[PDB]
Each structure stands twice: as structure tokens, then as C-alpha cells.
């Protein structure tokens, strides 16, 4: 399949070169997979989700996304126009309030929720979770992310937006999950992107167009935007049978565009997520 005039990040993920605008992908499009978006929620009624999104959990007075961030991230995973895996099922877990804030205890509860909740969902091709959140180093937060991964969910987490070594942030610093840095449309490391040995992969993170609340759309930036490109890619590859939850991060790194990004600090991987799709 070919989607012309796609957001640059989608085009980038299916290209050996920057500077193109068509997204190419196998028509299976993540059908039969599921992606949890652990964030401020998802506006499931957005036309872009086509009935494939639902809220499954909140820790607040409402499950509505009153911020937009979670809706944007979900859009990059699986909206019809702005998404990587255009046929995946999307499940929203609201661990962040409408200010985008969440106590670590609530975030941890949300991760453990997903590890169990996948047993209540139909995801024959596999399960992914996108965590576009983070804070300072916490062994408890890392351990929760590790449990989620161990349970059979491909966990993708934001590296963080501090232009610093991600070793000092959680869940970014957890070795067993997929830690995602951000790049821009000219294949430069995004200026805010964290880096370091704990990163596994980069994805498009600067000036990313996606869904927003009130049935709208918005371009924003962050490692929070790169993460769902990787999460959607994992779901897409799992539907194709190319990899599994336990191996998807490694597979994505194995098959990435290599050595093509600029301003990658010495010691950080130079790997950009790539679907290796041949139309
Ligand atoms: Ca990993
Ligand atoms: Hg967002
Ligand atoms: Hg995004």
C-alpha cells in the first residue's frame, strides 16, 4: 500500500532516505494486533480512529483525554491518516491527568494493569504498549516496565526530552524495554532528545502531525512522538509474523537504517526505525 502526502515520519519509517512523502506498508496494517497507549487517555470518538480505539482504564474522575497528548500518541500508532499500523486495535490507559502529570504509583498500577488486561482482549498477532512518559530514575518504575515486557507485551518507552543521558530517567533506563530517542526530518537527533547506552532505537519525533482532542489535528514534538512510531511499527511487524513481543525491539534494531543520523553522541546507537517494506 501507498499513502501519498503522508506525515514525514510515516514516510521516513518506510524509506532508506529522508526527504520523501509517501508512506509504504503492507496492507495487513497491524490487523489482529493491539496497542495500549499509557498516557492522558484517547479521544476514541475521533473519526481518525474508525471505531478501533477504546478507553479501558483510568485512575481519575474521567477516562476522557482532556489534554490531547494521549490522543496524539494514539494517532501516530494507529489512526487512519496519521498512524503506522492503520488497522490495529488501540486501548487507552489514563495514568496521566489532564495536565499530563501522574504519580509514579499510578503509572506503575497502569503498567501492571496492562500485563493482566491483555488476557481480556483479542490480540492474536500480539500486544504492544506505548509509554510516552517519564521522570527521574526509579527502580520501582523500571521494574514495572520490566514486568509488563516479561508478561508478553512489546514495551516501547520515551527516552525523555532533557538532551541528557537517559540512564537517569525511568522507565527509559530499564534495559529490557525498548527505549526510543527522537529524530527530525533531516535525520538529525532532535535537539531535546535524550541519548546514551540505554537507547535502543530512534524514531521520528520533531514536528509530528497527528490527532488531537475535539476531533482536531496538531503538530507537536517529543520522544513521546517517536515512541508511538516504534510501537506501531512493532504491531505492524507482529501482524506480518516477522517478530514477537519478546524480540521486536531487537528485530527493529537489527533491521533499522544504520549510521544515517547526525549529532548522535559517541556511544549512543545510530539506528532509525525502518519497516523494510518492499512495495
Ligand atoms: Ca530491549
Ligand atoms: Hg502527545
Ligand atoms: Hg506522535
Curated annotation (Swiss-Prot):
The positions flagged as active site in the entry are 39 (charge relay system), 69 (charge relay system), 224 (charge relay system)
Transmembrane ranges, per UniProt, are none
Q: Which Cys-Cys disulfides exist here? A: 34-123, 178-249
Q: GO molecular-function annotation terms?
A: metal ion binding; serine-type endopeptidase activity
Q: Which cofactor does it need?
A: Ca(2+)
* Binding-site residues, Ca(2+) 2: 16, 260
- Record-listed E.C. numbers: 3.4.21.64
Listed binding positions for Ca(2+) 1 are: 175, 177, 200
Q: Which residues form the Peptidase S8 domain?
A: 7-279
Which domain of life, per UniProt?
A: Eukaryota
Q: What the protein does?
A: Hydrolyzes keratin at aromatic and hydrophobic residues.
**What family name appears in the similarity comment?**
Belongs to the peptidase S8 family.
Protein name per UniProt? Proteinase K
Organism, as annotated: Parengyodontium album
Section covered of the full-length record: 106 to 384 of 384
Amino acid at each position: 500500500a501507498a499513502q501519498t502526502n503522508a506525515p514525514w515520519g510515516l514516510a521516513r519509517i518506510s524509506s532508506t532516505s529522508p526527504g520523501t512523502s509517501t508512506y509504504y506498508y503492507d496492507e495487513s496494517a497491524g490487523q489482529g494486533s493491539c496497542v495500549y497507549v499509557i498516557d492522558t487517555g484517547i479521544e476514541a470518538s475521533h473519526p481518525e480512529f474508525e471505531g478501533r480505539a477504546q478507553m479501558v482504564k483510568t485512575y481519575y474522575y474521567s477516562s476522557r483525554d482532556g489534554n490531547g497528548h494521549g490522543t496524539h500518541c494514539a494517532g501516530t500508532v494507529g489512526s487512519r491518516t496519521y498512524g503506522v499500523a492503520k488497522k490495529t486495535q488501540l486501548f487507552g490507559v489514563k495514568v496521566l491527568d489532564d495536565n499530563g502529570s501522574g504519580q509514579y504509583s499510578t503509572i506503575i498500577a497502569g503498567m501492571d494493569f496492562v500485563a493482566s488486561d491483555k488476557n481480556n482482549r483479542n490480540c492474536p498477532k500480539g500486544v504492544v504498549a506505548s509509554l510516552s512518559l517519564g521522570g527521574g530514575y526509579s527502580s520501582s518504575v523500571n521494574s514495572a516496565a520490566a514486568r509488563l515486557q516479561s508478561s508478553g507485551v512489546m514495551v516501547a518507552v520515551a527516552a525523555g526530552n532533557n538532551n541528557a543521558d537517559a540512564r537517569n530517567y525511568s522507565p527509559a533506563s530499564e534495559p529490557s524495554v525498548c527505549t526510543v530517542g527522537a529524530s527530525d526530518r533531516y535525520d538529525r537527533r532532535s535537539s531535546f532528545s535524550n541519548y546514551g547506552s540505554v537507547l535502543d532505537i530512534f524514531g521520528p519525533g520533531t514536528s509530528i502531525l497527528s490527532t488531537w482532542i475535539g476531533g482536531s489535528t496538531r503538530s507537536i514534538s517529543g520522544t513521546s512522538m517517536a515512541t508511538p512510531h516504534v510501537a506501531g511499527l512493532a504491531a505492524y511487524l507482529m501482524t506480518l509474523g516477522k517478530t514477537t513481543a519478546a524480540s521486536a525491539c531487537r528485530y527493529i534494531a537489527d533491521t533499522a537504517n544504520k549510521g544515517d543520523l547526525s549529532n548522535i553522541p559517541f556511544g549512543t546507537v545510530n539506528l532509525l526505525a525502518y519497516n523494510n517494506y518492499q512495495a
